[PDB]
Amino acid sequence: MRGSHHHHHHGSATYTRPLDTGNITTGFNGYPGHVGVDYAVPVGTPVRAVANGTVKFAGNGANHPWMLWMAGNAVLIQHADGMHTGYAHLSKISVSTDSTVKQGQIIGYTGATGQVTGPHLHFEMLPANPNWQNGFSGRIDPTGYIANAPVFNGTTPTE
Ligand SMILES: [Zn+2]
């Protein structure tokens, strides 16, 4: 068995960026009524916490009935700023409601427990307390969390 003792300072990432952004402020990629963003990625891939906080929701797909469930696996957590972030269309959860979380921590596994077409990732970010009084529905751009994310082939601006 292999065992690690020392950790890295910067951190590695062999996974590529499925998107560049996601905003339902103008018009979504054919997904109407969407309050988040979706990234086509095969089911069973470990989902890590994009930022430390607290689990406000943990919809475990391991024992979830279809009595009160239809979307499948979901995870709502309060980020480091107090904002909210959901993780939907997963196949499993490693967390639990009211439990504390940490960035990069495996909070679940990707899935397709919603509609049967293809597995993906749903990332919805909202304020600490939204103003659902029309305007944004509290849902905004994940670009703030994707800027500190890995590199897809290498996107240069000029130089
Ligand atoms: Zn979605």
From TrEMBL:
<feature type="domain" description="M23ase beta-sheet core">
    <location>
        <begin position="34"/>
        <end position="126"/>
    </location>
</feature>
<dbReference type="GO" id="GO:0004222">
    <property type="term" value="F:metalloendopeptidase activity"/>
</dbReference>
<keyword id="KW-0732">Signal</keyword>
<protein>
    <submittedName>
        <fullName>Peptidase, M23/M37 family</fullName>
        <ecNumber>3.4.24.75</ecNumber>
    </submittedName>
</protein>
<keyword id="KW-0378">Hydrolase</keyword>
